[PDB]
Amino acid sequence: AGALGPAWDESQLRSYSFPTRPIPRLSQSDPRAEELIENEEPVVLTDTNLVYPALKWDLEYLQENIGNGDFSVYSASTHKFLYYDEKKMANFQNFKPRSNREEMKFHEFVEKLQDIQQRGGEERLYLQQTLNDTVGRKIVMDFLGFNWNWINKQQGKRGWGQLTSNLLLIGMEGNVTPAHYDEQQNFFAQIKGYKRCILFPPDQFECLYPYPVHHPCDRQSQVDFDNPDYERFPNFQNVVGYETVVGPGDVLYIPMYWWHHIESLLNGGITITVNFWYKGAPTPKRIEYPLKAHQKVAIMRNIEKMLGEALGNPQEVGPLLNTMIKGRYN
Amino acid sequence: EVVKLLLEAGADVNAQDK
Ligand SMILES: C[C@@H](CC(=O)O)C(=O)C(=O)O
Ligand SMILES: [Zn+2]
């Protein structure tokens, strides 16, 4: 609007080996949007006003008003901020994380951000912090001004469980969260800057090769999107994504179990996002066959969990599964 | 009992627990 030019251009997108097709961008009043959510397919909603009061947020406003709580800030010497569960690192002591978590005050995050910009350093930062009671007064008022009427009615219409968390995300241009899926429904509310989102449906599990359930990187893809090892991950040559770029005011529905790869646009400045994580609807009373892909994903996860428990050691899960299949099911 | 045991979903997300 106002003829301010192209918000972004394709030069700012990283290059990958797979094709994509676009996620629909719709008005929340469009019946097709309702259709996509009800069928757990991704959609970008352009006019929800979900986080309208937060669109004025920048680092200055937040430092002044977000309080003096602790904020988890991840640091990496690479653009890939691969998520890992610190609590599972015991199971895989040969795993050396490439990003480190550091607690700090918000003004320390801005200052550390400022230093890196001055020194031209290569270090990268990504703040990822659940919002909680410790936020300042004006942030509380903004939070209350979110469109709870709209999102509460979505939660009720879809039979979802409780809102578990709102994750505040502040990243540097070029930051990447590698492909993974979450076990909760997500309304991904973009606030500042532009994020390219590439989603893959649950039925491409075979092409994306998640880590073992007991690995710290459970639910994350093993494939290095920047250099896919096609000999270890041959079916990654069959992956096809759903792509969009969200900017301030957009809300992307990331359905539960859907893989997503998220990157802050190159040379786009900092990005700010707040997500809305809801527990999924319960498993229905009557089961309809054939099962959906995501039901099979749930089954596979539980098989891995139970074997790790029964065998008394996650390291024995792999060997037992191979014993099961070799010359029997393959 | 067993079929619903295997179909039961978790709720893990990309947010570190304390
Ligand atoms: C961590 C995040 C993506 C990002 O880096 O914005 C994500 O997967 C999510 O909100 O569920
Ligand atoms: Zn996610």
Author numbering:
A (entry chain A): 20 to 349
B (entry chain B): 3 to 20
What does the paper say about this structure?
2-Oxoglutarate (2OG) and Fe(II)-dependent oxygenases couple substrate oxidation with 2OG decarboxylation to give succinate and CO2; they have important functions in human biology, e.g., in hypoxia signaling, extracellular matrix biosynthesis, lipid metabolism, and DNA/RNA damage repair. The human 2OG oxygenases studied, factor inhibiting hypoxia-inducible transcription factor HIF-α (FIH) and aspartate/asparagine-β-hydroxylase (AspH), catalyze C3 hydroxylations of Asp/Asn-residues. Like AspH, human factor inhibiting the hypoxia-inducible transcription factor HIF-α (FIH) catalyzes the post-translational oxidation of Asp- and Asn-residues in a 2OG-dependent manner, however, to give the β-threo hydroxylated product. FIH was initially identified as catalyzing hydroxylation of an Asn-residue in the C-terminal transactivation domain of HIF-α isoforms (Asn803 in HIF-1α), a reaction that suppresses HIF-mediated transcription.
High levels of FIH substrate hydroxylation were observed for 3-methyl-2OG and 4-methyl-2OG, both of which are natural products, regardless of the substrate, indicating that these 2OG derivatives can efficiently replace 2OG (entries 2 and 13). NMR studies reveal that FIH converts 1 and 12 into 2-methylsuccinate with a similar efficiency to which it converts 2OG into succinate. Notably, 3-methyl-2OG is an efficient cosubstrate for both FIH and AspH (entry 2), whereas its isomer 4-methyl-2OG is apparently more efficient in maintaining FIH compared with AspH activity (entry 13). The FIH Kmapp-value for 4-methyl-2OG is similar to that of 2OG, indicating a similar affinity; by contrast, the FIH Kmapp-value for 1, the 3-methyl regioisomer of 12, is higher. The observation that the conformations of C3- and C4-alkyl 2OG derivatives are very similar to that of 2OG in complex with FIH is in agreement with their similar Kmapp-values. Although the C3/C4-alkyl 2OG derivatives were used as racemic mixtures, the crystallographic analyses reveal that, at least predominantly, the (S)-enantiomers of the 2OG derivatives bind to FIH, potentially owing to their ability to engage in more efficient hydrophobic interactions with the hydrophobic Leu186 and Leu188 sidechains. The increase in length of the 2OG C3/C4-substituent from methyl via ethyl to propyl appears to correlate with enhanced FIH inhibition. Thus, although the C3/C4 methyl-substituted 2OG derivatives 1 and 12 do not inhibit FIH (entries 2 and 7), 3-propyl-2OG inhibits FIH efficiently (IC50 ~2.7 μM; Table 3, entry 4).
